[PDB]
Design a protein around this ligand. Sequence first.
Ligand SMILES: OC[C@H]1O[C@H](O[C@H]2[C@H](O)[C@@H](O)[C@@H](O[C@H]3[C@H](O)[C@@H](O)[C@@H](O[C@H]4[C@H](O)[C@@H](O)[C@@H](O[C@H]5[C@H](O)[C@@H](O)[C@@H](O)O[C@@H]5CO)O[C@@H]4CO)O[C@@H]3CO)O[C@@H]2CO)[C@H](O)[C@@H](O)[C@@H]1O
Ligand SMILES: OC[C@H]1O[C@H](O[C@H]2[C@H](O)[C@@H](O)[C@@H](O[C@H]3[C@H](O)[C@@H](O)[C@@H](O[C@H]4[C@H](O)[C@@H](O)[C@@H](O[C@H]5[C@H](O)[C@@H](O)[C@@H](O)O[C@@H]5CO)O[C@@H]4CO)O[C@@H]3CO)O[C@@H]2CO)[C@H](O)[C@@H](O)[C@@H]1O
Lengths: 368, 368
Amino acid sequence: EEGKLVIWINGDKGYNGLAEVGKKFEQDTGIKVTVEHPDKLEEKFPQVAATGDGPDIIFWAHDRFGGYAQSGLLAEVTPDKAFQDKLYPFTWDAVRYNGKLIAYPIAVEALSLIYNKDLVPNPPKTWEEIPALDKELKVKGKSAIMFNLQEPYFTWPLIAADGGYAFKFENGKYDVKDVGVDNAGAKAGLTFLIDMIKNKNMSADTDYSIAEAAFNKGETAMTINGPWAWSNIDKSKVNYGVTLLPTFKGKPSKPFVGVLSAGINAASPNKELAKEFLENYLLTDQGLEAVNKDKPLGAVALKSFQEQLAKDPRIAATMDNAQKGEIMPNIPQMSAFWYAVRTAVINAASGRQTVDAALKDAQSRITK
Amino acid sequence: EEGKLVIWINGDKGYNGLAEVGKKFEQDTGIKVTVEHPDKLEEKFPQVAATGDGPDIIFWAHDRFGGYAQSGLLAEVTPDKAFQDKLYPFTWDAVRYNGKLIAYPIAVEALSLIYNKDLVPNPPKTWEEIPALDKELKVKGKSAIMFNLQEPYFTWPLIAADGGYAFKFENGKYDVKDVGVDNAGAKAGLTFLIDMIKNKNMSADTDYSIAEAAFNKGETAMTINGPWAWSNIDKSKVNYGVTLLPTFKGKPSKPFVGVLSAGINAASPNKELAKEFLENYLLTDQGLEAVNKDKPLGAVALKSFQEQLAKDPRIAATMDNAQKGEIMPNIPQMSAFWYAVRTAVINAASGRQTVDAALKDAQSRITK
Ligand SMILES: OC[C@H]1O[C@H](O[C@H]2[C@H](O)[C@@H](O)[C@@H](O[C@H]3[C@H](O)[C@@H](O)[C@@H](O[C@H]4[C@H](O)[C@@H](O)[C@@H](O[C@H]5[C@H](O)[C@@H](O)[C@@H](O)O[C@@H]5CO)O[C@@H]4CO)O[C@@H]3CO)O[C@@H]2CO)[C@H](O)[C@@H](O)[C@@H]1O
Ligand SMILES: OC[C@H]1O[C@H](O[C@H]2[C@H](O)[C@@H](O)[C@@H](O[C@H]3[C@H](O)[C@@H](O)[C@@H](O[C@H]4[C@H](O)[C@@H](O)[C@@H](O[C@H]5[C@H](O)[C@@H](O)[C@@H](O)O[C@@H]5CO)O[C@@H]4CO)O[C@@H]3CO)O[C@@H]2CO)[C@H](O)[C@@H](O)[C@@H]1O
């Protein structure tokens, strides 16, 4: 039924308090909210939603929602980034399935030991001591502990303690044996660069200083650079804009995204001072501003200062290109990648190798 | 040298502005900060830090830091959770290596197209149109574009556009063929439960209602339950505390962590209204409070309301147990896990099966 909301929530939750939220909703909008707590709602939902019925909103712990999403029974949820930042990131992770958010997280639950302060002022720290405690309580006509033995949720914490688990999780990883430096897409893009060189649209010996000087003197119409370069263009005569990289074969250019980072030397005798400087001086609105006014940093990691920068169209363009690209890996094999690709590009642009032979050699260097 | 800070940062960054931050540091603390920008600092650092020298702090894009961390050259950084929440989560991800944070993220960089508004008011959207643009500019003694061709950072966005990549990333995944329901640790914990039953410390037919009534009437000293149960104990005569689950064989009990979640039915004709209710009524301080006063939610996903709850020792204990446990998977196979483990526990506790035969059968159900 359109124009109202039906909600299902389990009978052990605060469904009367939720109903009070629904009354405020109606009072503000006229839309009636009905809260129900059917038994076995988590089993009924897939059966009724598959026929296009059921409630508008279903509450359960997240463990049930991947099965619902796999069957197409859930709408993708569409919160903007402002709303997403209101909730803890790990709670969104709990409701992501196949890369999409498929629920709103509400609350984080875990079992605890609940004890009667007047019967056991000092509750047992070990399971093994509970039988002796029970013996003393049984002479008083009491028992040490009772909990639900019918639902495995309640017995699982004991089963997992010494090593039981449900499914093993394999952390995300880069496959270092698998590299895309000599595939057809890489060759196509490098061939286009070499064809511009052959056509004398560019020169293979152009380096950072040559390109910067040419652009900042008004000799070339465009350049490719990062935020650190903007300060020198500000001081030049050139009125410049910052925008998306050109597309190739209709697809976006994909710049590697770098996070400028400050590491503390493991040999440093000043680790406490380094922490203080970085946390309490550099990573402040005022600290980042002092660096940024020298040479722009780009988008910054500090949420409070980034909010002040996001307005700048140069920063907007930086983040647009960043979102089309990829974060760099931090793995040790990244330097091998860069050394090999550097040689391949210089060899191909200078005619020391074909594009194919250059990128094949780079691929062999990186993976063998 | 102890009692001062030496910083290395690349020569294209704002090292004079960083030096100004270091002057404010000295003025406040008397500790001198020296900022250097050596050439090839990213290659020199591993050579000098391996001998126990080098700078206290090194700046570079994060791609270099996994190699440093792999060689033991970086201190693990130790920000508390308050500081971590000041920076964007994906920037911390960039400086995590083998599960540890090994740098402070500062700024997010990507290349952009920089254009001269007075030479190309409408900059080209495609690479392919740049040669024709260059031809017209060359008759004016100008060129269309110049950028650094010596460093692969600048040519990679074009190489990646049609399909080039560095290393393929494999997303984290649960291995559904690999289940820990019948390993030695699971059997040990379930055997201890069965031994308590045999010893008449517990009864195999105890369910949720029986245990709740017994605890809330003062007949048993302890129970195991979640936040939703606290409201009924508040109303009872019992003075209760909430604490860590007991250990087993010296290891923590590991409760599964559930995120109470609200999904929107894909068949709902009211998806816009559902979004409004959940985002703007339920997921507010006032909305969660109305539910929480009925039956406590536990820790909540909404950062602003959770800050008000974290003070409660019951919530502290909830999160302590949660951190010792595991987040539930959301995969479709989770319901099979629960149905099979439910049968195993009830069969073993009732004597319908041995612990070994029960858990073996559950393992077979879940994985075949
Ligand atoms: O007729 C035979 C049988 O019926 C009855 O048992 C059945 C249940 O009525 C029925 O709900 C179903 O239970 C399944 C459930 O469908 C399944 O999802 C899974 O449940 C998990 C939760 O998914 C998980 O979130 C967690 O639940 C917590 C919850 O997070 C928390 O917020 C609070 O609500 O406590 C919950 C635990 O009670 O863990 C549970 C697992 O414990 O597994 C359930 C099975 O255990 O199927 C039941 C069996 O058919 C009768 O009770 C039974 O006597 C009859 O034999
Ligand atoms: O003597 C032979 C050779 O010497 C010179 O080239 C060498 C360089 O001096 C040297 O620095 C080294 O360069 C490597 C570098 O060590 C390696 O880490 C990798 O560099 C990556 C960055 O790691 C990555 O962050 C990104 O760098 C951006 C950076 O994020 C950004 O903030 C800004 O600073 O621009 C940087 C790009 O310039 O990408 C670079 C890769 O481009 O790979 C480098 C190699 O390309 O080794 C050089 C070669 O030995 C001379 O220049 C050369 O002519 C001589 O032949």
